[PDB]
């Protein structure tokens, strides 16, 4: 994957986006995601994985001040709310708009209209790994039909009977919680589905083409290394696109077979 | 016992120097008492009204469906003033009302209100204007059937 072709792809795509939005123009250019599309020879996963994987970016996403973050933790929510109000930095305190534990989430948001209201009221959802297996049933297809706002896993449990939430929270230190929350907010998300296609949001239209090229390169490297089974002989195609633009190829494979074991005369 | 425990907590809070609202939360209870419920209906605060079917004297509740219809309140007639008393920790209750509930039960309250509307009020929309009674005795009905059969035969 040559980086110059990626850089000229970002340049051409941004020029196309601006000339399409010219026909408020800067508001239309803003909030326009850039999608990296991976096509594989086989299904990347044998079943639906509803927990996104995190890829760390040199240029983190969701850095705007208007992004609202909803944090779902284990019981009790009072300790985490006190940690929000008291011992978090100001930018994260402004970013996090709601803290609600799993019991209150199950109590108040069992209805589909309540789930849709919670979906509309926030942009980024973070979720503790202790309770994230119970969130598909608690949030339904409202949060899990579309992979855009699926809850990103965060680690809040302190690393090592029934635990009473009032006496203990079993939580890791607050600066570690801060670092984990910032890392998960800034990290790009990969969603594993039984498909030959995978779409990853890598940036916006107002960003620089060098930033898009670096982000695309690092997510390609980490995602082929980690999340793609059978490495590079499973990767078929790479594309960069917008919500309404066409797909610009980056790396198209030469071998369309999986391996030599598919060869039979 | 719950009221004594809440009052002990509030007295502790006052003695240490915070308001009672710092330790106590806003209650959500079934509203009861006939004068109180009629006042809530007149002030349009009641969301759902349940009226017992066996209030003696009947004059205490005979105006209540008309009052609820004028004020737009959903009402339902239910069997058992003792059944309402079991809700309100009393022997009997003539009428109960819901004004507001908690957020985890607002969906259930809306579903119950719609169910009560569609399955009770639309069905009793026509039958509430009819005259009751007029049923004949067993021997009177048999005599009437016998004389109608005789008139049809002759």
């Amino acid at each position: 994957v040559d980086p110059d072709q990626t850089l000229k792809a970002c340049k051409a795509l941004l020029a196309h986006i601006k000339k399409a939005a010219a026909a408020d123009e800067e508001s239309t250019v803003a909030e326009t995601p850039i999608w990296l599309t991976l096509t594989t020879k086989k299904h990347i996963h044998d079943s639906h994985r509803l927990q996104p994987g995190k890829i760390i970016l040199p240029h983190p996403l969701n850095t705007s001040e208007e992004i609202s973050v909803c944090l779902i933790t284990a019981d009790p929510q009072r300790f985490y709310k006190n940690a929000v109000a008291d011992e978090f930095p100001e930018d994260l305190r402004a970013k996090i708009g709601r803290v609600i534990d799993i019991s209150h989430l199950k109590a108040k948001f069992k209805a589909y209209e309540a789930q849709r209201k919670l979906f509309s009221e926030h942009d980024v959802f973070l979720a503790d790994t202790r309770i994230i297996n119970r969130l598909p049933k608690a949030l339904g297809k409202t949060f899990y039909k579309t992979t855009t706002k699926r809850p990103i896993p965060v680690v809040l449990m302190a690393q090592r009977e029934k635990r009473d939430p009032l006496e203990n929270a079993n939580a890791r230190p607050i600066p570690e919680i801060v670092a984990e929350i910032r890392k998960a907010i800034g990290a790009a998300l990969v969603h594993l589905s039984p498909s030959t296609n995978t779409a990853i949001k890598v940036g916006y239209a107002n960003w620089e083409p060098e930033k898009l090229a670096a982000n695309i390169e690092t997510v390609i490297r980490e995602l082929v290394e980690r999340f793609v089974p059978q490495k590079w002989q499973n990767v078929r195609n790479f594309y960069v696109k917008g919500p309404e633009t066409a797909a610009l190829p980056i790396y198209q494979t030469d071998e369309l077979w999986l391996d030599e074991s598919k060869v039979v005369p | 016992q719950e009221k004594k425990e809440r009052l002990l907590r509030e007295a502790t809070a006052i003695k240490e120097g915070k308001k009672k609202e710092d330790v106590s939360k806003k209650p959500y209870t079934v509203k009861y008492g006939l004068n109180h419920v009629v006042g809530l209906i007149e002030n349009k605060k009641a969301s759902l009204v349940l009226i017992a079917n066996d209030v003696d004297p009947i004059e205490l509740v005979v105006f209540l469906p008309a009052l609820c219809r004028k004020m737009g309140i959903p009402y339902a007639i239910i069997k058992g003033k003792a059944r309402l008393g079991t809700l309100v920790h009393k022997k009997t209750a003539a009428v109960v009302a819901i004004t507001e509930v908690r957020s985890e039960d607002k969906n259930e309250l809306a579903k119950l209100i719609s169910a009560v509307k569609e399955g009770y009020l639309e069905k009793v929309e026509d039958t509430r204007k009819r005259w009751g009674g007029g049923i004949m005795g067993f021997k009177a009905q048999k005599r009437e059937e016998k004389r109608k059969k005789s008139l049809e035969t002759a």
């Binding site: 209209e113 | 007149e42 309140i73 607002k106 309250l109 809306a110 719609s114």
Partner: peptide, 26 residues
């Protein structure tokens, strides 16, 4: 005859004005 859908259904009334015995505090 003359937010959430749950909120609208719970708060829905008729167009007739409310009746008050007196002015209440608060």
């Amino acid at each position: 005859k003359g937010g959430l859908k749950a909120d609208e259904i719970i708060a829905q009334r008729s167009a007739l004005p409310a009746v008050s015995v007196r002015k209440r505090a608060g």
